[PDB]
Design an enzyme around this catalytic site. Structure first.
Site, PDB file in Angstrom:
ATOM      1  N   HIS C  19      42.789  28.498  40.905  1.00 44.48           N
ATOM      2  CA  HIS C  19      43.690  28.862  40.054  1.00 44.48           C
ATOM      3  C   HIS C  19      44.857  29.749  39.374  1.00 44.48           C
ATOM      4  CE1 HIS C  19      42.023  33.391  38.243  1.00 44.48           C
ATOM      5  NE2 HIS C  19      41.758  33.085  39.865  1.00 44.48           N
ATOM      6  N   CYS C  38      47.674  37.534  41.526  1.00 50.51           N
ATOM      7  CA  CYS C  38      47.062  36.763  41.193  1.00 50.51           C
ATOM      8  C   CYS C  38      48.091  35.314  40.201  1.00 50.51           C
ATOM      9  CB  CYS C  38      46.673  37.234  39.663  1.00 50.51           C
ATOM     10  SG  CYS C  38      44.760  38.251  40.920  1.00 50.51           S
ATOM     11  N   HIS C  46      39.099  30.931  45.524  1.00 49.53           N
ATOM     12  CA  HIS C  46      38.058  31.532  44.613  1.00 49.53           C
ATOM     13  C   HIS C  46      36.815  30.725  45.164  1.00 49.53           C
ATOM     14  CE1 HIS C  46      39.701  35.032  43.533  1.00 49.53           C
ATOM     15  NE2 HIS C  46      40.360  34.342  42.954  1.00 49.53           N
ATOM     16  N   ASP C  83      33.751  22.819  39.886  1.00 41.89           N
ATOM     17  CA  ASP C  83      33.132  22.706  41.353  1.00 41.89           C
ATOM     18  C   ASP C  83      34.552  22.013  41.851  1.00 41.89           C
ATOM     19  OD1 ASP C  83      32.624  23.496  43.975  1.00 41.89           O
ATOM     20  OD2 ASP C  83      31.489  21.834  44.280  1.00 41.89           O
ATOM     21  N   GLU C 129      33.791  37.039  41.670  1.00 34.78           N
ATOM     22  CA  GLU C 129      34.980  36.348  41.996  1.00 34.78           C
ATOM     23  C   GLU C 129      35.423  36.467  43.865  1.00 34.78           C
ATOM     24  OE1 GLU C 129      38.584  38.592  41.637  1.00 34.78           O
ATOM     25  OE2 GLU C 129      38.692  37.674  39.628  1.00 34.78           O
TER      26      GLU C 129
HETATM   27 NA    NA Z   1      47.488  32.648  41.776  1.00 33.85          NA
HETATM   28 NA    NA Z   2      32.294  35.709  45.751  1.00 36.71          NA
HETATM   29 ZN   LIG Z   3      41.814  35.252  41.348  1.00 36.58          ZN
END
Ligand code: NA
Ligand code: NA
Ligand SMILES: [Zn+2]
Ligand code: NA
Ligand code: NA
Ligand code: NA
Ligand code: NA
Ligand code: NA
Ligand code: NA
Ligand code: NA
Ligand code: NA
Ligand code: NA
Ligand code: NA
Ligand SMILES: [Zn+2]
Ligand SMILES: [Zn+2]
Ligand SMILES: [Zn+2]
Ligand SMILES: [Zn+2]
Ligand SMILES: [Zn+2]
Lengths: 140, 140, 140, 140, 140, 140
Positions: C19, C38, C46, C83, C129
């Site tokens: 992401h 991020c 992740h 997934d 996460e």
């Molecule tokens: Na990113």
């Molecule tokens: Na984790």
């Molecule tokens: Zn992240």
């Protein structure tokens, strides 16, 4: 020819099983003495962690030591023999070899080797009987 | 009087046991259908993680919600009933209540409550049947 | 009628996804400032741990809060959506709601609720996460 | 106005510290009896796991319950007081309140609350003294 | 004679201890520079994980590399020397050898070897000072 | 001269990254077949655990195999290249070598070796792509 880097690849799975530690070569008293609470007549059980470690050249095209999809299938075949089973009663092997985790590690190593598409890369099996008791076997 | 801060105290231990999920109120076919591989006739097993959570005022002198030494002894008494045993065959309770982890959590909560020096602080029991399947119970 | 004990049942699985945290309601500079690393333009990723917690009466016959086989299938349906995917690009929901783990927890809770045979027992979703950053959501 | 979903956000860190459990309101014998090996005169120590759990509305723009970058800084300020220190000798608070993990949880909760940019969202602190002994505190 | 399969058996336990890294062969300034926060004058502490790994032939009768009951007793004897203690002040060995985890691993290996019924199978000791810092030693 | 005990020292850290497994030496169909869901066009991601293991003589003065403060800095330099990045798009190395975890382990080993103050003690790198899939590399 060009020899590629050697890397290990290890895959972790688990199975739940019952067992009782009892040798046919020991008397009842000797079995109680050798195995203690592990000789409980109705058995006990574990979630066994199984780790399968391979070692080999990295393939230049796929970047893999071994095809994980293939390993997953081969490991499944072995796990089918022991998962949600009673080792001593449901698995022929354990009728004649005590189901200590040492012997489980050997069993899983040998059974996996027997079903593998490329058994030459099999390097090590680990069995964790509990998080505190860990066994490994690298074959003959 | 002065009410002290409320804190929780949780203690984690484990036990190894065999079981088979089989209800006396179901037919053989129904038991197979309800319980699947868990109904394997010779059973299977788990390392069960047991967490015992207490909640109460911090004592101003000892700084404790409960005496850990005392809890350890009380938890040992409960664990003695199930560790290295077969739940359905060795533990009277499970002759008449199915040994699902839901019912194990209830059993352990109630048995612990029955042996505790100060049962009023018992707040929650957790049973992890495997690292992926977790059950909790807070009593009536 | 007799109300049975209330127990929780929690099942843990995982999914791997890419992401990038980027809000369409923020400028480029604001997105960089709000989201920092991020907001890396090519994204990051992740292994998300997903825990699904149910709460309800224990069934007197099966001894279960819910059928685990059924939950596994329902959870699979949700996991199929995320997934080995890119959340922001492959999952319609995240085109219009930022893919923070707060919003992932909400997404998974709501999507699961939407496919469940008995959604009334859904109690809590957890998303980890990373092992250090944990989010939970209990619905409206 | 529109109330947003309520989600929890928890961040896990750790610190290493020495301590000795010894109350100034107890005699030497009483301290030995209450605290046992924890009263060892030269102390002992733990890697303490600290988890900080926040609860609040998800922000519609950032998608966050709280800014993790900000939390990291605030948690660092608290951790600086205890990491690689002796609790009873180096931390003023523990001169007059016993350093049981119950009281550590309270200390960390209150110290964090004291440095937070938005303390209203602080919901729970967890201290794991070891992997087996876990304490939580939710304030007054 | 028939040589049996070679398997490893590893047992995991833990101890809580205080220490301070300070060499008598360094000046105060040098100790501060070498050891940093680890030189804090009142010390700090760890839950140390100790893993004891044995390697040897599987016994054909017992199925074991070593008797776990015996290992537990021998490991207890070693753990008694360090658990809930201050390494540098309570353990004679550390008066003259710095208590880095490297040297702790050596200490535990040698002390265990000294009490073992069959020391020939001792293969490796692991000390985890924290979950992130891991040391191993295999002897001379 | 006196050769000191040989001990290993291992340090564990992590990084979050996106990737897609796609070889420029394979056709689109071959890439789909070789890599399966890992070839998802918009990628996916992992929290990678990185463990760096050193082996060498214990220093008689410091008691260390290597200065952890120095290792932390060197490891940071490597982690900066991959953390919160897309391996295939942001890291030059992966433009021409597939980003399988085998090849990531090699990359991290070689990049670390390139920045180390004392690279002779570098012994092994581990990459855990997930908790279930573990890779190691010991160099040429
Ligand atoms: Na990113
Ligand atoms: Na984790
Ligand atoms: Zn992240
Ligand atoms: Na038994
Ligand atoms: Na295990
Ligand atoms: Na069964
Ligand atoms: Na478990
Ligand atoms: Na002490
Ligand atoms: Na801990
Ligand atoms: Na110190
Ligand atoms: Na540790
Ligand atoms: Na992909
Ligand atoms: Na991982
Ligand atoms: Zn057993
Ligand atoms: Zn079961
Ligand atoms: Zn303590
Ligand atoms: Zn230390
Ligand atoms: Zn991947």
């Amino acid at each position: 020819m060009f020899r590629m880097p050697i890397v290990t690849m290890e895959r972790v799975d688990s199975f739940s099983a019952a067992h009782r530690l009892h040798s046919e070569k020991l008397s009842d008293a000797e079995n109680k003495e050798t195995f203690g609470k592990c000789n409980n007549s109705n058995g006990h059980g574990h979630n066994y962690v199984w780790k399968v470690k391979l070692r080999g050249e990295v393939d230049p095209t796929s970047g893999m030591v071994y095809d994980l999809a293939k390993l997953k299938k081969e490991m499944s075949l072995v796990l089918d023999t022991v998962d949600h089973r009673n080792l001593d009663k449901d698995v022929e092997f354990f009728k004649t070899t005590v189901s200590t985790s040492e012997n489980v590690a050997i069993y899983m190593f040998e059974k996996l080797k027997s079903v593998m598409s490329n058994p030459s890369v099999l390097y090590k099996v680990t069995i964790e009987e509990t998080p505190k008791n860990i066994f490994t076997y690298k074959g003959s």
